[PDB]
């Protein structure tokens, strides 16, 4: 049989797909996640804050 990729296929998005949220997903916290401090963030982190005494 043909072992190569098929170039004659639909290259566009499928509108006939389920548009709703999936109830069959893992509802639990992920234990396999980066536990470290992520040395990539805005180090000048004064971007925008309330300048008044109260929120």
């Amino acid at each position, epitope marked *: 049989a043909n072992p190569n990729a098929n170039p004659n296929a639909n290259p566009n998005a499928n509108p006939n797909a389920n548009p709703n949220a999936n109830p069959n997903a893992n509802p639990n916290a992920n234990p396999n996640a980066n536990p470290n401090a992520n040395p990539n963030a805005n180090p*000048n982190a*004064n*971007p*925008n*804050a*309330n*300048p*008044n*005494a*109260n929120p």
Partner: antibody
Amino acid sequence: QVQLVESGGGVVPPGRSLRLSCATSGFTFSNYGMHWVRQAPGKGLEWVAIIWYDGSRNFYAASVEGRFTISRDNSKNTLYLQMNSLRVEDTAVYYCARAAYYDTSGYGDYWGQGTLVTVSS
Amino acid sequence: SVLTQPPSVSGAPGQTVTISCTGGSSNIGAGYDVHWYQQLPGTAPKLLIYGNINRPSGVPDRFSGSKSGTSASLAITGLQAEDEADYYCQSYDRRLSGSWVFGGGTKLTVLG
């Protein structure tokens, strides 16, 4: 009622300083932060600087950082804006406006009259 | 001038005109609010709309606004002779170190 009156404008040769102020009345000056906005003749508005209510945090625009200084004396209800080494490009109408925060952005509920500072040679 | 506003728009008295402010994914598309100011020719700018839907007591009910994605608009109905003024859109930009960013500004003309 909130009243913001500005004074201290005029014509200044380039290379020297000129000090502005904005007097406040009718609201607790010490409990609000407040901004500076300048408008060049025939141009739009451009944000200048903001100071926190306690004065702890100061923010300046990229064009005037290191030259402009903003300071407040809450016992006189007057905010002070020092502009050192004035250039010809600093000719604009400066506005003093109170700071407000709605959800995630800032805006000015009350604005002052505004004063003109012209630099020419 | 990170925000873009048309140089000038015009319309007949009493009609509806649209003033639009197109931003980017960093200022308007980032989820930050847009505030509109109406500056009279002879006085300081006055607050018009805050929170993208809320207006002060002085602002009449004709003025309204909304935002979607990276763009925001100011909708004015029933144009009057006193509506001739400059309108500015204001938001916050993540990529700069300024609390506010101002657009080019739109001059509104009423064909009186």
